[PDB]
Design a protein around this ligand. Structure first.
Ligand SMILES: Cc1ccncc1NC(=O)CC(C)(C)c1ccccc1
Ligand SMILES: Cc1ccncc1NC(=O)CC(C)(C)c1ccccc1
Lengths: 304, 304
């Protein structure tokens, strides 16, 4: 028992982190097989970031201008190319530490672990969710660019995110490993609107089920609701509307606890309308939404 | 910017995790050099746990009864000994993945990362604090015993905790790597009182400084206080009394923000007396105490 914001063990990802330097800029790169992936803004200077013409800036760069270092060894760059907002630096050596891996584009509301890195060295690991508005509320400083988000299914690392930038609001934006930004963000130092964010309803409900599994039951009530009634409350409180697909994914949690999904919805409804009354749930004084139904089952069963 | 409950990269510790089986019981062991460390209750059966005579139970065990497996390789056991509540199984092979390491006994209120493991395989990593009452609010299921807590200073892993048990209250108890329990706990299935816990005042203040660094300033006020006045409030709210040593460790944070420690104490005083008024600080609706002043500086500067 106990419930924690648990990240995946970062070992397989630590073995892939390298430092990429181009001119005066240094950031992180991901070395998989004989390719190093990093944000394309590594080729920019501070002046370039206001309106960079990446194609033109990349033309002034040759393979020898990209300095890739894995701890203390220098990798030899034999090819360079830009794919969307990422640079792919072909190196002459395959990473001996390359795990089984995939590149996946996660959906908003899904979770992942981030291995924050500076100068190609891992500093820490934390779990987060891709917000419905496609930002991430991470912890990143200058030099963290190129740090990646991932999930692990036994021995396979699914890379889902690469960090590119911090919005003037202090929230984070980045790409999938094909260099496509999550959200409307562009790799340019300009004011950029992150959309209106919403709370991930299915995740809050999954977390309410984790609370019941771990003994926190005070919020359970004698009521039930309907999808339409609950969604009227979700609307008022900027919660994502609940669908039958979300109800279906909560099935395992509903089965284990024997608390019908719509009954758990009624608990969430009363919590939204009345607040916590100064009480806590799983050590939190707010409704937590960065645990998916899969995360809850995984943690509550002990999947390695 | 952004502030997260960040754990250390678990890579160096993943390389040390093994499975230890004795008779019918399986748990985790830590393989460092030619020694495997694990909880001594690995030698017990369910009936034994009510009042185990570990010395007598260990006498019925020989080196060949301890099955140690690192992934798929079987380690050959050539020695066994009990040191306090841990068993040290000498193996004939030094772990090739042994990092630079130390065994340290952490102080209550200090933090560490836990690599939760089942059957010798890592499932996740999370950051936590040793409570002032010497328990940890972790996330552990049956089979998690032998999972360890640690801190990392560049290349040196300081192991501070090994998980042994869950108290009937759902909180966790364990030992340092010499097998000494943190707190009054014993490895026996009996009712055990965890002492009255308190909130780690110096950690809450460090976290208030992290909030100011990251833009959350609403709680700052026009007031100041004294150590004695603040401690009268700390007493009423079950907060650890603040000492000049705590003020001294907050020095770097006080220097960076230019907010005197006693002025930050006055903010904490008003937050304790009035609550959050439905607002949040660093995404939390409660006063967070599992970040030390060192954790805050490290995260806010990007130490790898
Ligand atoms: C200081 C910091 C903290 C966390 N994450 C990223 C950064 N910094 C940046 O975003 C700056 C830069 C040049 C990389 C950039 C990139 C795309 C668009 C505009 C600017
Ligand atoms: C179920 C679970 C979850 C998390 N951590 C530990 C456990 N289980 C135990 O503590 C049981 C056992 C036999 C290992 C034990 C050990 C010392 C004292 C009494 C019992």
């Amino acid at each position: 028992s106990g419930f924690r914001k648990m990240a995946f063990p970062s070992g397989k990802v630590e073995g892939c982190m390298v430092q990429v330097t181009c001119g005066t800029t240094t950031l992180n790169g991901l070395w998989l097989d004989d390719v190093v992936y990093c944000p394309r803004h590594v080729i920019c200077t501070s002046e370039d970031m206001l309106n960079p013409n990446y194609e033109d800036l990349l033309i002034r760069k040759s393979n020898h201008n990209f300095l890739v270092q894995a701890g203390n060894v220098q990798l030899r760059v034999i090819g360079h190319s830009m794919q969307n907002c990422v640079l792919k630096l072909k190196v002459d050596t395959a990473n001996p530490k390359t795990p089984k891996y995939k590149f996946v584009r996660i959906q908003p509301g899904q979770t992942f672990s981030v291995l924050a890195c500076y100068n190609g060295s891992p500093s820490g690991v934390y779990q987060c969710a891709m917000r419905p508005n496609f930002t991430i509320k991470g912890s990143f400083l200058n030099g963290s660019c190129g740090s990646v988000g991932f999930n692990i299914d036994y021995d396979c690392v699914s890379f889902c995110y690469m960090h590119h930038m911090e919005l003037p609001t202090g929230v984070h934006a980045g790409t999938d490993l094909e260099g496509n930004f999550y959200g409307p963000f562009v790799d340019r130092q300009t004011a950029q609107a992150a959309g209106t964010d919403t709370t991930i309803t299915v995740n809050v409900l999954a977390w309410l089920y984790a609370a019941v599994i771990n003994g926190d039951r005070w919020f359970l009530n004698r009521f039930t609701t309907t999808l339409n009634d609950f969604n009227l409350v979700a609307m008022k409180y900027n919660y994502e509307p609940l669908t039958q697909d979300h109800v279906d994914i909560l099935g395992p949690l509903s089965a284990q606890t024997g608390i019908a999904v719509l009954d758990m919805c009624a608990s969430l409804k009363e919590l939204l309308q009345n607040g916590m009354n100064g009480r806590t749930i799983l050590g939190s004084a707010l409704l937590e939404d960065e645990f998916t139904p899969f995360d809850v089952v995984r943690q509550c069963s002990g999947v390695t």
